[PDB]
Motif scaffolding. Structure first.
Motif, mmCIF file in Angstrom:
data_model
loop_
_atom_site.group_PDB
_atom_site.id
_atom_site.type_symbol
_atom_site.label_atom_id
_atom_site.label_comp_id
_atom_site.label_asym_id
_atom_site.label_seq_id
_atom_site.Cartn_x
_atom_site.Cartn_y
_atom_site.Cartn_z
ATOM 1 N N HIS A 18 43.866 -21.546 19.774
ATOM 2 C CA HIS A 18 45.316 -21.406 19.957
ATOM 3 C C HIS A 18 45.716 -19.941 20.150
ATOM 4 O O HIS A 18 46.514 -19.598 21.000
ATOM 5 C CB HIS A 18 46.084 -22.092 18.828
ATOM 6 N N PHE A 19 45.150 -19.049 19.339
ATOM 7 C CA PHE A 19 45.406 -17.637 19.507
ATOM 8 C C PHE A 19 45.030 -17.212 20.920
ATOM 9 O O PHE A 19 45.831 -16.579 21.596
ATOM 10 C CB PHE A 19 44.685 -16.831 18.412
ATOM 11 N N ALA A 20 43.846 -17.612 21.396
ATOM 12 C CA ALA A 20 43.394 -17.120 22.686
ATOM 13 C C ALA A 20 44.354 -17.567 23.785
ATOM 14 O O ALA A 20 44.692 -16.820 24.702
ATOM 15 C CB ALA A 20 42.014 -17.629 23.006
ATOM 16 N N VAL A 21 44.721 -18.846 23.726
ATOM 17 C CA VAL A 21 45.474 -19.423 24.811
ATOM 18 C C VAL A 21 46.911 -18.908 24.778
ATOM 19 O O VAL A 21 47.593 -18.864 25.809
ATOM 20 C CB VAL A 21 45.363 -20.955 24.715
ATOM 21 N N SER A 22 47.348 -18.437 23.616
ATOM 22 C CA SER A 22 48.689 -17.915 23.430
ATOM 23 C C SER A 22 48.919 -16.643 24.253
ATOM 24 O O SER A 22 50.062 -16.252 24.467
ATOM 25 C CB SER A 22 49.005 -17.672 21.980
ATOM 26 N N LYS A 23 47.835 -15.987 24.686
ATOM 27 C CA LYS A 23 47.922 -14.737 25.421
ATOM 28 C C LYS A 23 47.558 -14.933 26.897
ATOM 29 O O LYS A 23 47.606 -13.985 27.695
ATOM 30 C CB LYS A 23 46.965 -13.724 24.773
ATOM 31 N N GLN A 24 47.200 -16.154 27.285
ATOM 32 C CA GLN A 24 46.771 -16.390 28.650
ATOM 33 C C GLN A 24 47.951 -16.816 29.523
ATOM 34 O O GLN A 24 48.298 -17.996 29.523
ATOM 35 C CB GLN A 24 45.716 -17.472 28.649
ATOM 36 N N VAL A 25 48.542 -15.877 30.277
ATOM 37 C CA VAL A 25 49.800 -16.142 30.980
ATOM 38 C C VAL A 25 49.691 -15.926 32.484
ATOM 39 O O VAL A 25 50.565 -16.369 33.230
ATOM 40 C CB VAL A 25 50.930 -15.293 30.363
ATOM 41 N N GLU A 26 48.559 -15.384 32.940
ATOM 42 C CA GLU A 26 48.393 -15.013 34.341
ATOM 43 C C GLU A 26 48.743 -16.190 35.246
ATOM 44 O O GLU A 26 48.159 -17.251 35.113
ATOM 45 C CB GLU A 26 46.949 -14.576 34.619
ATOM 46 N N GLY A 27 49.710 -16.003 36.144
ATOM 47 C CA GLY A 27 50.031 -16.988 37.170
ATOM 48 C C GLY A 27 50.733 -18.242 36.649
ATOM 49 O O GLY A 27 50.889 -19.205 37.396
ATOM 50 N N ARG A 28 51.135 -18.269 35.368
ATOM 51 C CA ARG A 28 51.669 -19.470 34.754
ATOM 52 C C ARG A 28 53.190 -19.366 34.577
ATOM 53 O O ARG A 28 53.723 -18.306 34.251
ATOM 54 C CB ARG A 28 51.008 -19.667 33.372
ATOM 55 N N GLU A 29 53.873 -20.520 34.622
ATOM 56 C CA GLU A 29 55.248 -20.598 34.142
ATOM 57 C C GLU A 29 55.306 -21.164 32.716
ATOM 58 O O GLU A 29 56.229 -20.821 31.967
ATOM 59 C CB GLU A 29 56.099 -21.311 35.201
ATOM 60 N N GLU A 65 58.849 -17.926 26.075
ATOM 61 C CA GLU A 65 58.998 -18.332 24.682
ATOM 62 C C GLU A 65 57.865 -17.760 23.825
ATOM 63 O O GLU A 65 56.818 -17.387 24.329
ATOM 64 C CB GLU A 65 58.946 -19.866 24.577
ATOM 65 N N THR A 66 58.035 -17.781 22.499
ATOM 66 C CA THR A 66 56.931 -17.541 21.574
ATOM 67 C C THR A 66 56.034 -18.772 21.529
ATOM 68 O O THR A 66 56.494 -19.907 21.374
ATOM 69 C CB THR A 66 57.434 -17.205 20.168
ATOM 70 N N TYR A 67 54.716 -18.540 21.649
ATOM 71 C CA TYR A 67 53.755 -19.598 21.558
ATOM 72 C C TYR A 67 53.587 -20.032 20.112
ATOM 73 O O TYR A 67 53.434 -19.205 19.220
ATOM 74 C CB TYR A 67 52.409 -19.180 22.131
ATOM 75 N N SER A 68 53.578 -21.355 19.907
ATOM 76 C CA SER A 68 53.241 -21.897 18.598
ATOM 77 C C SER A 68 52.489 -23.203 18.771
ATOM 78 O O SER A 68 52.777 -23.997 19.676
ATOM 79 C CB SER A 68 54.447 -22.178 17.757
ATOM 80 N N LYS A 69 51.623 -23.477 17.806
ATOM 81 C CA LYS A 69 50.981 -24.779 17.787
ATOM 82 C C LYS A 69 52.023 -25.894 17.603
ATOM 83 O O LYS A 69 51.834 -26.992 18.103
ATOM 84 C CB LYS A 69 49.984 -24.852 16.652
ATOM 85 N N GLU A 70 53.092 -25.619 16.854
ATOM 86 C CA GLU A 70 54.087 -26.644 16.521
ATOM 87 C C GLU A 70 54.992 -26.966 17.709
ATOM 88 O O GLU A 70 55.615 -28.017 17.724
ATOM 89 C CB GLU A 70 54.952 -26.202 15.349
ATOM 90 N N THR A 71 55.153 -26.042 18.652
ATOM 91 C CA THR A 71 56.184 -26.187 19.677
ATOM 92 C C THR A 71 55.590 -26.386 21.077
ATOM 93 O O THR A 71 56.221 -26.982 21.949
ATOM 94 C CB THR A 71 57.151 -24.998 19.661
#
Length: 103
Positions: A18-29, A65-71
């Motif tokens: 979850h931490f890793a994916v929370s920072k992976q934003v390249e090319g994404r909406e 948004e802020t990434y969260s496992k809950e949201t």
């Protein structure tokens, strides 16, 4: 070198994915989120390093948004891809993502 860890259902490896994916934003909406952890290796050098392979899906959260496992829940149960991240946890500095790649 890298040592295989099992079992892979350990809650720790989920959180690191979850931490890793929370920072992976390249090319994404939208952020991606974690569906399942499939493989884990570790190596101790300048801290603990974790190499975690996992399945992802597109999440409900926009990258503004802020990434969260809950949201950030998966929009579908379709596997978008399988990814491998390396997370470095220094002994006494902030953890960070070393690398992230997907098939």
């Amino acid at each position: 070198g890298w040592q295989k860890k099992t079992p892979v259902d350990n809650e720790q490896y989920k959180e690191l994915a979850h931490f890793a994916v929370s920072k992976q934003v390249e090319g994404r909406e939208f952020f991606d989120t974690v569906l399942e952890v499939t493989d884990v290796e570790t190596q101790v050098v300048a801290g603990t390093n974790y190499r975690i392979t996992f399945k992802i899906a597109e999440s409900t959260c926009r990258v503004t948004e802020t990434y969260s496992k809950e949201t950030c829940l998966p929009k579908t149960r379709d596997v978008k891809s399988t990814c491998t991240a390396v997370i470095t946890e220094p002994l006494n500095n902030e953890r960070f993502v070393h690398s992230f790649t997907c098939g």
